Amino acid sequence: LLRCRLPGGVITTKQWQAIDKFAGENTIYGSIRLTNRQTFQFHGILKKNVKPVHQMLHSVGLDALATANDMNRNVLCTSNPYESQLHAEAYEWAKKISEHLLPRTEPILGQTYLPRKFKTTVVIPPQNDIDLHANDMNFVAIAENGKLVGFNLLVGGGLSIEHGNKKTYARTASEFGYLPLEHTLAVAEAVVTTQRDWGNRTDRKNAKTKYTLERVGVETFKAEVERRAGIKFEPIRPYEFTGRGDRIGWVKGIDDNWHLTLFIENGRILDYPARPLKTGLLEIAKIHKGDFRITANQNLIIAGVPESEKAKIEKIAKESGLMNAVTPQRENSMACVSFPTCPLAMAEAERFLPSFIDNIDNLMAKHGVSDEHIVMRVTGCPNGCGRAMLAEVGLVGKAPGRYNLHLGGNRIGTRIPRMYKENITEPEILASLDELIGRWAKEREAGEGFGDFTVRAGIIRPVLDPARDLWD
Numbered sequence: 001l002l003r004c005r006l007p008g009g010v011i012t013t014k015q016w017q018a019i020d021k022f023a024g025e026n027t028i029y030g031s032i033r034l035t036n037r038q039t040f041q042f043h044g045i046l047k048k049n050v051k052p053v054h055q056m057l058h059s060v061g062l063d064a065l066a067t068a069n070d071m072n073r074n075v076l077c078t079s080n081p082y083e084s085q086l087h088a089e090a091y092e093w094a095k096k097i098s099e100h101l102l103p104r105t106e107p108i109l110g111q112t113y114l115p116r117k118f119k120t121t122v123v124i125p126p127q128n129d130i131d132l133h134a135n136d137m138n139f140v141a142i143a144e145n146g147k148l149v150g151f152n153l154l155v156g157g158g159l160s161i162e163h164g165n166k167k168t169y170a171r172t173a174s175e176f177g178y179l180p181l182e183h184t185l186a187v188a189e190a191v192v193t194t195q196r197d198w199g200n201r202t203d204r205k206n207a208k209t210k211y212t213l214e215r216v217g218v219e220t221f222k223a224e225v226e227r228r229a230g231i232k233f234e235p236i237r238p239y240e241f242t243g244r245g246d247r248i249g250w251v252k253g254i255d256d257n258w259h260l261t262l263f264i265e266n267g268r269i270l271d272y273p274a275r276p277l278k279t280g281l282l283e284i285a286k287i288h289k290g291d292f293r294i295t296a297n298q299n300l301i302i303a304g305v306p307e308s309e310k311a312k313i314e315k316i317a318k319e320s321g322l323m324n325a326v327t328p329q330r331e332n333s334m335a336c337v338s339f340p341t342c343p344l345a346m347a348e349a350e351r352f353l354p355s356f357i358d359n360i361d362n363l364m365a366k367h368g369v370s371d372e373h374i375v376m377r378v379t380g381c382p383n384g385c386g387r388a389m390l391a392e393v394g395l396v397g398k399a400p401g402r403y404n405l406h407l408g409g410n411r412i413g414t415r416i417p418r419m420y421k422e423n424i425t426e427p428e429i430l431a432s433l434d435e436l437i438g439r440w441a442k443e444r445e446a447g448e449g450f451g452d453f454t455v456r457a458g459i460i461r462p463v464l465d466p467a468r469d470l471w472d
């Protein structure tokens with residue numbers, strides 16, 4: 001397994017052609033796997049190819065630095081903002097934060113480095129596609145007159161739990177305050193160093209920022225950040241989210257620019273019988289004027305297609321099976337890699353999701369809600385890579401063919417789903433949802449999501465303060 005550092009998921013067509021080649025020739029699986037942190041992975045790299053992989057990345061200006069250690073992981077940035085012009089500067093900031101937090105090999109990270117991996121994002125409301133609540137540090141962009149003026153800082157998100165261990169918990173990020181744009185790096189550095197100093201290093205299961213914040217308190221942590229940064233946080237500026245999904249299909253950008261987001265199931269790029277997904281993308285990379293953007297939903301955006309080139313690109317994407325129409329449900333579902341490559345896997349996730357969604361699609365159809373969607377995620381084990389702990393319906397692997405069923409998150413991802421049923425099989429999971437979806441379809445209010453419904457309808461108690469009420 002090799003994972004690339006790719007701030008904001010922006011990758012050039014030249015870089016793409018290089019990863020496509022290596023993936024095809026030098027890996028056991030021969031696939032490109034887009035991850036939910038806006039970057040990619042190769043699976044099964046032969047030890048002989050370990051050297052040429054870094055050379056290959058480097059030759060195209062890429063690097064795999066801090067992508068799988070107790071450091072700062074890939075920094076995310078909203079991929080396709082409604083106000084298209086805001087992407088450029090938000091992206092430049094994600095890239096700056098990523099570089100600023102990189103190891104000097106350690107003034108920021110320290111010799112011992114960080115107690116645990118640190119995750120950061122740059123968010124452009126109203127989109128929470130990057131799932132800010134799964135991250136340690138988040139910069140929510142505040143714009144005025146089409147220019148960014150600063151960021152609201154949210155700290156402390158993290159989803160990993162350990163089965164039956166009430167000392168572990170998923171936690172959402174807490175608001176600290178607003179900071180003018182110029183204080184960004186000082187603040188970023190301040191949060192990392194405080195966590196580095198205060199983080200429990202002895203017990204790795206308690207090292208994460210979410211635990212540190214709970215131990216010392218948000219205000220205590222906040223004061224130190226201000227002390228260290230040399231600033232005083234201003235009050236949080238208004239922001240709201242409306243969703244977390246990608247904008248599948250064509251959307252108009254700035255000027256005569258267009259963006260085509262392609263839905264890629266499980267982000268698994270390979271040539272399949274009659275669906276040459278991998279070749280189709282290579283063909284588009286060869287004629288595409290612009291970049292590609294890997295989304296936090298494991299999808300790919302062919303960005304900045306001049307209006308004149310739409311038909312060209314669309315022809316290839318269509319013929320390659322990249323534009324095969326799926327239901328809104330499939331578009332809003334996600335799973336982690338899990339087997340066969342993950343050594344920590346308990347239950348299938350990626351290889352289970354397609355057929356599972358085939359079944360969910362039937363149930364949605366049976367209830368007359370086939371145009372609707374429920375943010376549904378499956379994570380192969382409690383480490384939570386599939387981000388099931390921010391889903392409306394989350395399945396958490398517990399053993400081969402058995403999952404813990406969680407309910408009650410919301411569409412925007414600001415609430416953690418409580419465990420509903422434990423250690424059950426697919427047929428048992430489907431039977432529960434069949435009934436639940438039936439009720440939502442008939443009892444819901446106008447535009448009410450499934451998660452909110454289960455909470456309003458008393459089907460599941462909401463998680464109001466994860467550190468204290470996530471576990472029954």
Ligand code: SRM
Pocket residue numbers: 001003034035036037038039040041067068073074116119131134135157158159160161208298335336337338341342343344383384385386387
């Ligand atoms: C590819 C990805 C899932 C996906 O299908 O997209 C993934 C895959 C793996 N994760 Fe992850 N994680 C991925 C997003 C996350 C997320 C979601 C997110 O960051 O948005 C989380 C939940 C949020 C959080 O961190 O709290 C997550 C929490 C973990 C953890 C538990 C961390 C913890 O704090 O306890 C581990 C295990 C560990 O570090 O001990 C882990 C471990 C792993 C490893 C590297 C397994 C290992 O330790 O050997 C998994 C590799 C599987 C494979 O064969 O590819 N992965 N993982 C994501 C790669 C992100 C990236 O490119 O950087």
Ligand code: SF4
Pocket residue numbers: 336337338339342343344345346349379380381382383384385386
């Ligand atoms: S959630 Fe568990 S099974 Fe899935 S990729 Fe992460 S570590 Fe592996």
Ligand SMILES: O=S([O-])[O-]
Pocket residue numbers: 068073117385
């Ligand atoms: O190592 S997981 O966070 O990708």
Ligand code: NA
Pocket residue numbers: 263264265266267297298299
């Ligand atoms: Na996808």
